[PDB]
Every structure is written in structure tokens, then in C-alpha cells.
Amino acid sequence: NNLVKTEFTNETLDKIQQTQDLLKKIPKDVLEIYSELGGEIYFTDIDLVEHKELQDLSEEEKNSMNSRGEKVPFASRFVFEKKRETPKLIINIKDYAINSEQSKEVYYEIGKGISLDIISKDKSLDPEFLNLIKSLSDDSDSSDLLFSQKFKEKLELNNKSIDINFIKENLTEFQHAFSLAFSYYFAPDHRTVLELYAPDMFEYMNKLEKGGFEKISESLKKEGVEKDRIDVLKGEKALKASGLVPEHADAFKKIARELNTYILFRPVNKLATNLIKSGVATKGLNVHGKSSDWGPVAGYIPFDQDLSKKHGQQLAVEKGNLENKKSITEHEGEIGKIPLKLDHLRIEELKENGIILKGKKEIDNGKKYYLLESNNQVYEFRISDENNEVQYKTKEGKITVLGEKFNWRNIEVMAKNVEGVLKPLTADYDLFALAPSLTEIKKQIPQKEWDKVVNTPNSLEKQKGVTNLLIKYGIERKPDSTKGTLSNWQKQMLDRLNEAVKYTGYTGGDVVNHGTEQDNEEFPEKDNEIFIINPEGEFILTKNWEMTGRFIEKNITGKDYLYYFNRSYNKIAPGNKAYIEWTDPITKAKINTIPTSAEFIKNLSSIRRSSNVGVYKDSGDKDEFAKKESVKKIAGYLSDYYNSANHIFSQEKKRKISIFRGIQAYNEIENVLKSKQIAPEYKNYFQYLKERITNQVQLLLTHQKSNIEFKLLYKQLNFTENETDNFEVFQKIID
Amino acid sequence: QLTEEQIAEFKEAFSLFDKDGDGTITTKELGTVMRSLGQNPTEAELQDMINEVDADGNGTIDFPEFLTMMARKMKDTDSEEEIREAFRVFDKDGNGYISAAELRHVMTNLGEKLTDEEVDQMIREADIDGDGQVNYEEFVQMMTAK
Ligand SMILES: [Ca+2]
Ligand SMILES: [Ca+2]
Ligand SMILES: [Ca+2]
Ligand SMILES: [Ca+2]
Ligand SMILES: [Mg+2]
């Protein structure tokens, strides 16, 4: 934000060597306060009247309390402050004249001053006692009732104790002062005048110079960021939709700091938040049953799927049950079912949460049962007294969608083995991503290795050796029988979390069972709200897929943290066949990048496998072979573009030698685009390719001499029979 | 176990460089089918694969003889992915390009003291088109090319 703009560089130094002289007198901070408030200063040549490019109809003269003394003859001005939004101070100069009667340049200070008052200290935090009591210097503190310079028509009211009883009414008048005080303290002439008349405003202004100006130039610099930020609801305001159990989130807070790495989580269902604290273990990869959000079972994985969200989905349920069975079938000993035993607190919880209604009681087989009501319309429920088991049956006037009908049975839930004990299951902590600091990964590499790497004489090979190191010990992710797909640190990290939520009190085992959704290449999910725990310990919850993205770019991507994103982004994940978008820098630059031999041949193969017709068909038309022979020609130029011997050249040549090779390709493309019946599909492609090349070559030009436009440059070339001198021509064109 | 799509390429390419349009390629011809595909066997590493099957007139593979040749070195490799993530890591600003400024930067947090000289130097040797920066492509090359 370059604060000052010099319009006309017309007069010799005189004009300039005047504006400078003007500003070099105003404190660097007083300027920083300006720029900070977003202001800009305008020094222009002869533009007295409403003539400046910013001197037209907006907030102009509304009420008339103008200069030091009030005047308002506008047209007779040379200095002005565009009062309303960002402060726009505009000043113009003419001949060699401010020093003789500095009584003129002083307005450049007050005219300015109205810059910082009303947003300085006089009122910027509020009329903070500092200025509120300093203002009291009317006639109560010092024996200096010499405020006749700033308090005339508006404060000859010496007969009125000026504290909070009256200062508000005229915030404005107390500016006319801070200004003149400013104009005086800095006026090239009368500085002492301020020090000899009002004795405090001098010290006030002085402290301001002392550092008082760097003050606001910070409480504003700081509120510079905090203001315009990324709206995420931080703190427990987030920890609420987070889902995670607070004692845990906190437990986590430690790791984040120690290891220095952002921890991100997807939404953890609220209806399981407590089943967790309670001690219910969490769902691993082994189980694929659907949770539930209603009735007693809510927040558990009902072995009976008609008792979960997909209640009614005669096919989801039909395939849902089908999944708990296999879950058990396949992983016996570790996965099976047990009776739903809602405990104490849970009941009162699903109560004020309106999931279940505890009422009328009843008797059966000699045991007590408190009927557990639920506005469901096919299943009735009741919980025991002896043990809190829960049961249900098909109402006498309904049926199960699968076509089942039964009497009081217990509600069984899925449960994993945990210390030789089938504990019931609920939602887990599905990490969305883990972003360790680059420095952290550095401490993941075994010194000797990183050493054997750096202790090399090959400048470029070193870089490589490192990158691989960084790749091996940091970006690589392997598969796993147990924890899904993840990295190694990812795993050591995955532990520290559970052990962290263990020395807390959890007795359900683990709460984080697998790798980050960033490896959910299979069935990627898109959650609007993402909970994140920075390396500092603060809680955060984004609101959009975009904000999360934006957030990650500002705090992780371009700060010093390692982060990779789901390989299936911007592609079409097979499993759920979903397209989830995520900003990719490489793609950003694609438009301006000539394609590669392979990237080219690829896009051909592609289309072939779509409009079954290929660039060239296996036939005899000597026109076909023309085409074949001709793409083989492109798949050569493009290949030549990216030559690794291009190093024995200089930057200057590279662009040239390349821009040419580039043009070469572009040519043979125009050549085939002007061929026989090349399917219109390929036609479009080549049209696409052309543009790249174009963009590329342009970019390569702009790096050098730039009055040349690909279009022109191309014309001037001749790719008829002799390509030879053509290149010598080319060079000549770029001089 | 190459995918079908993974196959179409290996043909589109394998054919394009089949001059005498039959369905078999010479040795030099193989060298080129792959080079173009963005790979590159060594002058001698080029034989041991083709050389390994000699039923076509000793020194010429068919379409399968080739397709089935895309296992030895392929039913293992997947680095092409990491390398692209390595790249997004050094491109600290999101421009799709890696500047010497950011090389030096990431290069040091990882704990390497690089001389302001020896950076503008790496960047240079990785730059092929001469625009001073290294793009995913130039990068991909510098990495894999051995
Ligand atoms: Ca042949
Ligand atoms: Ca043979
Ligand atoms: Ca960059
Ligand atoms: Ca480049
Ligand atoms: Mg999970």
C-alpha cells in the first residue's frame, strides 16, 4: 500500500523537492496510521478546484466547520481530505512558497490531522481517559487556562465541568483541536508555541511521537489481520458442532503443540458424542453398518438395519443387514453383536434431546419394564429394570419392510472385541487430514540417510536426493491390514492420539482407527464443516468446502506444513463415482503449458476409447498414413520441447530454441487441422492444443522482448520446403 | 495388471511408431515407443526385455510381446504420484511453478544450508524452456530422469 501518489512530475525537483520536504517532517508512524486506515495521499500539479480525478461529487461540504478558523471558500483551497471512507488526502503545489508564511503549510497538517483524531486516540479506542482527562485541561488541572487557540466558539463554556457529561455532544470540536495541536507540534515553525501555551497537549503530542503513534499503528495493524480473516467459528463455539468429546479435543490439544501439526476431523455425530465419553468403543473398517438417529438404539449400529437411518429403504436395509452379518461372519472373535444396554445418563440425554420418551411402566414374567416410547410407526420399545437392556417388537398393526413380524426381542448392536470383551459400537473420529510441519518430517528421517544424501557434489542431484527423502519419510502412504491406508508418521500420530485420549479416561479402546479421508480415493466424502486443531492449540471449524480449502491454503499449503490432498479430487472417484473439486496449482498453469509427448499420445488414446474413431485408421487411404506420419511429427516436436540437454544453453537461448520447437509443433497441428476428415472430436482437441502452445510461446516471449504477438510472429515464418534459414529468420524477428 | 485405459495408450503409442504398419516393432522403434511415452530405457537395457523374447525373427515384438512387457518395470512403480505431491510442496505459493526463492525456502526448513548461488543454480539446470522457473513437467523430468 504505497501511501503517497505523485500526480504530475512536471515542475523540476521544485515540486517534488517540496512534497518530500513536506512529508519528511510528518512522523513515519503518523503515516503508517494513515496507510493502515487504508488512506492514500495525493500530491498533484495545478488542480486547485474540483478538478482532481478524485475531487468530484462524493462526501463533500455538508456542514461548514473547515480549517483552523472556519472558512469554507473551497475554490480557494489546495489541500483537502476526502472525509468519508478511506481517508484521501489531496494536496497540490505551485511555486517556491511554504516557508516564509508557514501559516499555510500548517493546513497540510491539520487538514491532515483530521486524519488521525477521530480514529486516532481522541476517539479511536474511545475518548479514552488519556484524552478525556487531558481534555479536562480546560481549566481544572494546570494554572494554564490558555486553550484560546483550540476552544473558542465551541468551548468558551469555561463554566461547565467537561468530563462525560458533555464531551460526547461535540466529539467533532475536540478534533478541531487534536488537529491544530498536531499542526503545531509538527509545523516547521511554531512547535514551541504549543509547548509554551497549553503545557499538556505538548506532552500529549510528544508522548505520541515518543511511541504513541506506533501504538495505534499496531492495534490497527493487528486488527488488520483479525479483521479481514477467514470466518471460522473458533473456540468451544466450534468444539460444539465438532462432535469430538471435549476432554479429548483438549487431550489432542497437547499433541498438536508437541509435534507441531494441524489435526483435522470430519463431523463426529452428536448422537455418539457421549456414548463415546461413556466408554463405547468406535467403529473400525471391519464394520460397514449404518448408524442411527432415532429411538433407543440411536447412535449405535443396530444389527437390525431397519432400526437405522435407512429405515424404510427396503434395499439399503436389505443390503445393510447383509453387511453386519459378513462383518461378523468374516471377523469372528473381534466383531459381533450384543444387547443394547442404555445406561443412566444416556436416557436423560435422549430425553431433553427428544429422541425417546420415558413413561408408563409395566409388568412381565415378574420383571419391571419402563415403556420407552418413540414416535416411530412400526416398532415399539421398552427397557428392563434389572439390567437396562432394551427390547422392541413389530406393532400388532404393522410389519417390517423386509416382511418380518415379531414379538419382544432385545435390540442388539454391533460390537468389536476390545480386551476380550464385545463392547458396543458408535461413531469414530474420522480424521480429515493431518498436517505436520516440514520441520517435523525432518526429524522423521534417520540422520545418516539425510547425511549420505546432502554430502554430495551434484547441485541438482542433492535436491533430488532430498525430495525423495522427503517423499519416502513423509509423503508416501502404504496400505495396511488394520488401519487402512496411511503414512508411517500418520500412524505414529494415530497412536499418540488414542494414548492421549486414554490417560484421559476412555476405556473403549481407540477413537481414531484409520488414515485420513485424504486417502479415501475410493469413496470420498465432502463435509461442509471441518474441525481443525492448529499447532498452537486453538479449535477451529470451517463452514464450506471452499473455506476449508481457502483455510488450508493460507494456513497450511503456503505456511510451512506438509499437506497432500485426496488423489481423487477433480477426478471421478470410482467407488461412489463422485467429483469433488479442490484447487490444484499445477492445473492453474496448465493453460500456459505446452503438453508433453506422452500427455499428448494419452489424450489420443482417450478419445479413441470414446468416439471409437482414432486420429488415423488402419487402412490404405494414403491420406490416413499422412495423418499418422503427421501426428508422429507432433509427438516429436513436443518431445523436443522438453529436452534435458537444454542445460548446456543459456536462459536467453532456451526460450528461443524452445519458442521455436513450440512453433514447430503448433505448425504441424495447423497442418493436420487442415487435413481430411479428422473426426470433429479430435478437431476440437487440436484446437485446444493449439491454444496451449500459443499461451506457452507467448509466455516465453513476455519473458524477453514483448511487442511480438504469436499471431504476427507466426505469419512471418515459412514452413514450406526449407526449414533451414527459417530459424535464422526467427531469431531476427526477436530483436 | 495394467488397466484397459492403461492399455489403449500402450497401443496408440506402440502403433504410432510402427512405420511398416504391420503390428511388430524394431528395437530402435521400441526405444522410441517408450521414450515418447515419457520413459527411456538405456541403450543396453532396451534389449534384455525384447531380447528376452525372440520368436519373431529374433528382434521384434508384437503388440502383446510388448503389452506383456509392461510388467517387469511396471507391476511395481507408482512414484509418478508422490513426485507430483513433492512438487506441490515446493511450489509454496500456488502458482504451479517452483521459484529459486521457494526452493531455497523449503530446502532449508528441511535443514539444508544452500548458498544463494547454488540455488539459482539448481533452478537453472531444471529449467528447460528458460523461463527461470521449473513447472510440474520440467520437475517431473528432473526427478525421474536418472
Ligand atoms: Ca514393424
Ligand atoms: Ca522376436
Ligand atoms: Ca511458486
Ligand atoms: Ca520453466
Ligand atoms: Mg470411520
Q: Which of the residues A51, A176, A288, A703 is marked catalytic?
A: A288
In the block, residue with C-alpha cell 482437441: A685
Q: Measuring CA to CA, how many Å separate A195 from each of A107, A190, A634?
A: 19, 9, 82
Flag whether residue A706 sits within 8 Å of chain B, measured between CB atoms: no
Residue B39: inside a domain: yes
Distance A555 CA to ligand 5 centre (A): 26
Largest CA distance in chain B: 57
Architecture of domain A269-427: Alpha-Beta Complex (3.90)
Burial category of B4 from C-beta neighbours within 10 Å (exposed 0-12, middle 13-18, buried 19 and up)? exposed
**What contacts A230, CB < 8 A, 6 or more positions away?**
A542, A547, A550, A551, A554
DSSP-based three-state secondary structure for A208: helix
Q: What is the DSSP string of A375-432?
A: S-SSEEEEEESSS--EEEEE-TT---TTS-----EE-EEEEE-SSSS-EEEE----EE
Rounded Cα–Cα distance for residues A307 and A287 (Å): 16
| C-alpha A543 chain-centroid distance | 11
Say whether A605 and B141 touch across the interface (CB within 8 A).
no
Q: What is the DSSP string of A643-668?
A: -TTGGGS-HHHHHHHHHHHHHHHHHH
Task: Kindly provide the b/e burial profile for residues A107-128, where b requires at least 16 CB atoms within 10 angstroms of the residue's own CB.
Answer: bbbbbbbbbbbbbbbbbbeebe
Residue B47: inside a domain: yes
Of B31, B60, B76, the one marking the end of a domain is B76
Task: Kindly provide the b/e burial profile for residues B91-129, where b requires at least 16 CB atoms within 10 angstroms of the residue's own CB.
Answer: bbebebbbbbebbbbbbebbebebeeebbebbbbbbbbb
**Residues of B in Cβ contact (< 8 Å) with A652:** 130
Segment (H or E) for A704: none
Estimate the crossing angle of helix B100-109 against helix B117-126, to 10 degrees: 120
The C-alpha angle A163, A165, A168, rounded to 5 degrees, equals 85
> Which of A533, A535, A336 shows the shortest CA–CA distance to A429?
A533
CB-based contact A32:A217 (threshold 8 Å): yes
B42 and B89 together in one domain: no
Strands A281-282 and A423-426: parallel
- As a residue count, chain A comes to 735
| C-alpha A526 chain-centroid distance | 16
B62 and B81 together in one domain: no
Say whether B136 and A589 touch across the interface (CB within 8 A).
yes
B88 and B144 together in one domain: yes
CB-based contact A158:A139 (threshold 8 Å): yes
Rounded Cα–Cα distance for residues A483 and A493 (Å): 12
- Phi and psi at B74, nearest 5°, equal -110, -35
- Torsion angle (degrees, nearest 10) of CA A649, A653, A659, A663: -90
Flag whether residue B131 sits within 8 Å of chain A, measured between CB atoms: yes
Rounded Cα–Cα distance for residues A697 and A155 (Å): 71
Architecture of domain A582-735: Up-down Bundle (1.20)
The C-alpha angle B72, B73, B76, rounded to 5 degrees, equals 100
Rounded Cα–Cα distance for residues A250 and A539 (Å): 9
Residue B66: inside a domain: yes
Resolution (A): 3.2
This structure was determined by X-ray
Rounded Cα–Cα distance for residues B99 and A72 (Å): 55
B49 and B92 together in one domain: no
Task: Kindly provide the b/e burial profile for residues A47-78, where b requires at least 16 CB atoms within 10 angstroms of the residue's own CB.
Answer: beeeebeebeeeeeeeeeebbbeeeeeeeebb
Cross-strand bridge partners of residue A426? A282
Q: Hey, what long-range contacts does A117-124 have (CB within 8 A, 24 or more apart)? A: A117/A174, A117/A175, A117/A178, A117/A179, A117/A182, A118/A171, A118/A175, A119/A37, A120/A33, A120/A178, A120/A216, A121/A178, A121/A208, A121/A212, A121/A215, A121/A216, A122/A171, A122/A174, A122/A175, A122/A178, A123/A171, A123/A174, A123/A175, A124/A216
Residues that constitute the known binding site of B for Ca(2+):
18, 20, 22, 24, 29, 54, 56, 58, 60, 65, 91, 93, 95, 97, 102, 127, 129, 131, 133, 138
Of B48, B76, B104, the one marking the end of a domain is B76
Of B76, B105, B126, the one marking the end of a domain is B76
Q: DSSP character for A129?
A: H
CB-based contact B107:A431 (threshold 8 Å): no
Question: How many Cβ atoms from other residues are within 10 Å of residue A351's Cβ?
Answer: 12
Q: What is the 3-state secondary structure (H, E, C) of chain B?
A: CCCHHHHHHHHHHHHHCCCCCCCCECHHHHHHHHHHCCCCCCCCCCHHHHCCCCCCCCCCECCHHHHCCCCCCCCCCCHHHHHHHHHHHHCCCCCCEECHHHHHHHHHHCCCCCCCHHHHHHHHHHCCCCCCCEEHHHHHHHHHCC
Q: Tally the C-alpha atoms within 13 A of residue A595's C-alpha that lie toward its C-beta.
A: 23
Q: Measuring CA to CA, how many Å separate A166 from each of A127, A139, A158, A188?
A: 12, 15, 12, 34
DSSP-based three-state secondary structure for A585: helix
Q: DSSP character for A532?
A: E
Burial category of A568 from C-beta neighbours within 10 Å (exposed 0-12, middle 13-18, buried 19 and up)? buried
Segment (H or E) for A42: strand A40-44
Q: Chain B 40-79, CB below 8 Å of chain A: which residues? A: 79
User: Any idea where the domains of chain A sit in the sequence?
Assistant: 1-228, 229-268+428-581, 269-427, 582-735
Which ranges in A313-382 belong to alpha helices (H)? 316-330, 344-352
- As a residue count, chain B comes to 146
Amino acid identity of A49?
V
Rounded Cα–Cα distance for residues A235 and A240 (Å): 9
Cross-strand bridge partners of residue A415? A336, A424
B58 and B20 together in one domain: yes
Which one of B16, B111, B143 has the shortest CB-CB distance to A632?
Answer: B16
CATH T-level fold of A1-228: Collagenase (Catalytic Domain) (3.40.390)
B43 and B85 together in one domain: no
* Domain that residue B135 falls in: 77-146
Q: Which three cell numbers stand for residue A108?
A: 497540510
Cross-strand bridge partners of residue A431? A265
Segment (H or E) for A625: helix A624-641
CB-based contact A540:A534 (threshold 8 Å): yes
Total tally of structural domains belonging to chain B: 2
- Nearest ligand atom owner, CA of B56: 2
DSSP-based three-state secondary structure for A461: helix
B111 and B61 together in one domain: no
CB-based contact A568:A524 (threshold 8 Å): yes
Amino acid identity of B71?
A
CB-based contact A243:A273 (threshold 8 Å): yes
Residue B1: inside a domain: no
B105 and B139 together in one domain: yes
Residue B122: inside a domain: yes
A122 is in an annotated binding site: no
Question: How many Cβ atoms from other residues are within 10 Å of residue A179's Cβ?
Answer: 26
Query: Is A288 tagged catalytic?
Result: yes
- Nearest ligand atom owner, CA of A483: 5
B68 and B109 together in one domain: no
Residue B49: inside a domain: yes
DSSP-based three-state secondary structure for A40: strand
Rounded Cα–Cα distance for residues B141 and A644 (Å): 8
B128 and B144 together in one domain: yes
Flag whether residue B86 sits within 8 Å of chain A, measured between CB atoms: yes
> Which of A339, A359, A356 shows the shortest CA–CA distance to A424?
A339
- Nearest ligand atom owner, CA of B64: 2
CATH number at residue B100: 1.10.238.10
B67 and B117 together in one domain: no
Q: Which three cell numbers stand for residue A489?
A: 508418521
- Phi and psi at A492, nearest 5°, equal -55, -30
Q: Which residues surround ligand 3, an ion (CB under 5 A)?
A: B 91, 93, 95, 97
Which one of B35, B37, B96 has the shortest CB-CB distance to A585?
Answer: B96
Distance A473 CA to ligand 1 centre (A): 45
B81 and B143 together in one domain: yes
Say whether A703 and B132 touch across the interface (CB within 8 A).
yes
